[PDB]
Amino acid sequence: KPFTLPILTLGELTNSRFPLPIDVLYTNPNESAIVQCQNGRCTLDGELQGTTQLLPTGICAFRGKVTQQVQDEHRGTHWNMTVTNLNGTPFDPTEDVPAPLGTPDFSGQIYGVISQRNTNTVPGEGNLPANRAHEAVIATYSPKFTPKLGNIQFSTWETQDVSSGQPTKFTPVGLASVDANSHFDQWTLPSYSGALTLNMNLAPSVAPVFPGECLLFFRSFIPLKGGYGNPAIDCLMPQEWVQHLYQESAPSLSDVALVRYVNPETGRTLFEAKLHRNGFLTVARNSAGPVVAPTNGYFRFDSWVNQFYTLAPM
Amino acid sequence: KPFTLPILTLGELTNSRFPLPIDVLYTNPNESAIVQCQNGRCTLDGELQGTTQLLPTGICAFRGKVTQQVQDEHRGTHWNMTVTNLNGTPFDPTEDVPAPLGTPDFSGQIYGVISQRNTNTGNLPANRAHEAVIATYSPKFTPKLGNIQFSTWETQDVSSGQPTKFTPVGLASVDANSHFDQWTLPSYSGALTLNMNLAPSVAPVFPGECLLFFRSFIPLKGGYGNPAIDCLMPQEWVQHLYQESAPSLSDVALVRYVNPETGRTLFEAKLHRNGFLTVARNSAGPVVAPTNGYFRFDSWVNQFYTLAPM
């Protein structure tokens, strides 16, 4: 079973860490943070890792039921939510995953919409249920953010119209804020079981092992509810690569696949990258910022090489 | 290049007409409406049709710029926005498509979020987002002309001339006055105008057969209802067929719905060249089967092939 990547262009790819299109390829060699995201994690032979799952709609989504309303001391409104697996089955905290698959993998205030469709139906309404939806924010750094224990909180403003004991969906849309008090850091993991407990079953950290190489990211810009900023979310591989690798189940013949970013119109290789077995890219680049490349481009598998292979500089 | 389908199970598939997971397989033999949706349209040899595009994030999304606030007889505040292609390039109305790719393909009040990130800039741009509704049956819904209208709940906090994104979430309502009908196309160029460049209607050509849909339930902002959106093929099938670009060897591919755990075929279906499924079923409602099931290509057959009843 030979190894292949999708032939989708950048404009045909989506982010595996938030429901966003891919905007640009991106590098940042001088990043000081450990890169250990948990969504968009898949080995080249198709083994999903971390909290990664296959649905584009599952990324940073939650399903469950609300239990109680609680206010904070700053007069904001919060709602306790028990969470299930995205497919509705109970989350088993002893499952060998960091958190329910799809759980956000970064610190911040995630903005979206909470919606509910009641289980009980009304005969006079054609045996149909009542519904409600509201804007909501989930603070993944909150001590109440404990998805591995089956419970999280979300916050709303100016509404009491959230029902307990009714099926609840969180649809992510963007970030609430990226100001200092909103604690946005795309490389800081949540404490999935709370502050004093160690995260478990994590996908491994990734890094270049070679002098002169840096990580290559698929970058998306993420919407903001308000305030100032131009926040971005960087993934190691787009969601369509996760879907492809999973289905193909091709044995990895070495620790590193050589790949070429090609202009199919000219047939020319624009640059080379190392696609590592654990599912991430490195390139020989000494600068930060976007990679300027034609819109028809995509990565193509060339051959299996090894860690000592020297990439041509970008 | 032999023909293949993805090996993704039902619980690993998403809808091609709204950003939702697939919940169930579904039939409705006695449907009176012409089925002619424009998203999730792809021939078996990988030709996208209608307003279909490849991004899961592009389905029922819009990109553009708000131009001005508008007043009308309805509550809430209203706004005009120009719409571009999803990749930001100007929409060319002479493109041989019904509307910008990703445009909603049904009548209703689509509920979502409008967000903005200003162009001009500390040196960081300003932002805002609000819940919004787009009435696709409205005379002001003219995406083929490069313009649509949306409504917000009372707020003035929407800026003119700034990059604007619509993220779909569900429906605002399904009451009679909200005109939800998943098989009624919008008038893409406005009232009294003919739609153009449409993907063709689909139907069973065989007695006793009916369409088979991939069904998703869609969230509601309020009111009573359990609305659903039915697609002909999931978004991952569109992605797979597009890339595979495999020649269709007949008008119909015979496919088997398999339980991979047991290896047994639960039922067979016809996968038609234009990109839709039919089955031999004489009832409406969900197909009750484990979510780990999936379709597998069996062989190329013809219009005269007789399916075993489900």
TrEMBL record, chain B:
Q: Which residues form the signal peptide?
A: none
Q: Where is this protein primarily located? A: host cell
Compartment(s): Host cytoplasm; Virion
User: What keywords are assigned to this protein?
Assistant: Host cytoplasm, Virion
Entry GO CC: host cell cytoplasm; virion component
In what residue span(s) does the Calicivirus coat protein C-terminal domain sit?
A: 83-310
Q: Does the keyword Glycoprotein apply?
A: no
Q: Which domain of life is it from?
A: Viruses
The answer on whether this UniProt entry bears the keyword Phosphoprotein reads: no
Protein name, as recorded: Capsid protein
Native source organism of the sequence: Norwalk virus
